[PDB]
């Protein structure tokens with residue numbers, strides 16, 4: 642059994658841990674929590690084989706700059722989630738894009754453009770925009786909702802294959 646190290650990053654108000662809770666025990670959290678660093682591991686059957694889903698959470702505080710670029714010496718799976726409820730988060734993705742690209746020292750890397758809060762009527766980011774950026778980033782776009790559980794597992798199963806594609 643291999644442990645798939647996946648790191649979820651993004652802006653504040655996207656609800657990163659919300660997707661995790663939805664994927665672990667199948668539940669949508671309403672209350673927001675300022676998570677600094679939480680550990681989430683679960684054995685799931687991916688591609689037929691039992692794999693260990695290692696999900697590490699990150700803080701939304703831009704004050705820990707010396708922590709963001711500290712142990713990020715290694716990285717197998719990156720998760721860039723954005724919310725269509727806020728256009729700033731969509732633009733903030735560009736900052737993380739170059740940030741990670743610079744730290745990774747590479748361009749090609751298994752990634753997925755996932756959008757949360759897609760069921761919210763506060764659509765500030767249209768679908769065309771996401772597809773446009775996805776084409777430039779070179780990664781697929783997957784609309785996901787934690788409130789209605791809109792294909793959550795499908796957004797993970799894809800990334801796992803991408804990693805295996807990059808490796809073999």
Ligand SMILES: Cc1n[nH]cc1CNc1ccccc1F
Nearest residue numbers: 646647648695697712713715716
């Ligand atoms: C911290 C730490 N304590 N024990 C091992 C590690 C490294 N793990 C890890 C590092 C970066 C992204 C994702 C990860 F799971």
